[PDB]
Predict the structure of Aurora kinase A.
Amino acid sequence: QWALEDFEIGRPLGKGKFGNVYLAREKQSKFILALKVLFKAQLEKAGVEHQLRREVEIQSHLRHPNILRLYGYFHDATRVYLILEYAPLGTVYRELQKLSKFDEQRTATYITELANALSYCHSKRVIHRDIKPENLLLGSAGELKIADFGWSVHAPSSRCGTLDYLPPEMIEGRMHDEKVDLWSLGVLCYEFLVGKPPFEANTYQETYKRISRVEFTFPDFVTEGARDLISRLLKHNPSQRPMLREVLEHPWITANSSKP
Ligand SMILES: Nc1ncnc2c1ncn2[C@@H]1O[C@H](COP(=O)(O)OP(=O)(O)OP(=O)(O)O)[C@@H](O)[C@H]1O
Ligand SMILES: O=C(O)c1cc(-c2cccc(F)c2)nc2ccccc12
Ligand SMILES: [Mg+2]
Ligand SMILES: [Mg+2]
């Protein structure tokens, strides 16, 4: 259905572990899109060909204003091509670098959109397991959009990078469910307000200890409504974390998030 012939390749949009993302335009419709390239050599050597097919199937069946659309895909003699929706405002990661911290309005709005998207994700019983600011893009009106889906799967499961966003049941090799995403939401909220995630360390081996113990402290400026929600999401026992409906209705979310 799709071949590389059908697009014109603009500038690079970012580097992934297995290749680049380029700006691109469909020649006959003039549609603007992002076109992720992955190299088959490196995909074979790493052994993720089947894992990538799992990402591609889960993502093409999702449609939500805060999930990044996958339109299609194709491959050739040496590479695989994912045709993704183009997010014109870049990543949340670069927004943090430029501003250092976020105010409570931006944070509570981002947490809302994140929780909405993860609610829909769970209704199709999909778990993302890897929401990093690296993987949260921003639409042309500033809306938050989840991307990647590289390490995502169906609940439950038990299948690299930094430990920082992984919950304790995952880093301990144990079995994990849909509350993996609730711990992740707690980590982002912290990082959005503070400028660094709550378990950062300069070594992998200490981030392990600090996640496992849940050893973290708030600085002065974090108001008590935000300490309340974060502490309720960063709980070693998965069952003691709330569900997304409680998050969407937390007094701190409602007072600071923007309206529908
Ligand atoms: N649709 C897009 N629009 C703009 N920038 C993007 C888009 N998709 C990705 N990027 C940028 O390119 C980078 C790499 O993309 P991505 O995270 O999807 O690759 P990856 O992490 O290597 O995926 P994989 O799990 O398959 O190895 C991102 O960190 C982001 O900065
Ligand atoms: O055997 C293949 O031709 C092949 C196909 C694909 C591929 C094609 C469509 C979708 C998708 F997710 C992956 N990925 C690969 C990765 C490494 C080595 C070979 C391949
Ligand atoms: Mg094959
Ligand atoms: Mg990524």
In short: The chain has two domains: 2-90, 91-257. Residues 2-90 form a domain with the Phosphorylase Kinase; domain 1 fold (CATH 3.30.200.20). The chain is about 35% helix and 20% strand. The first strand starts at residue 7 and ends at 16.
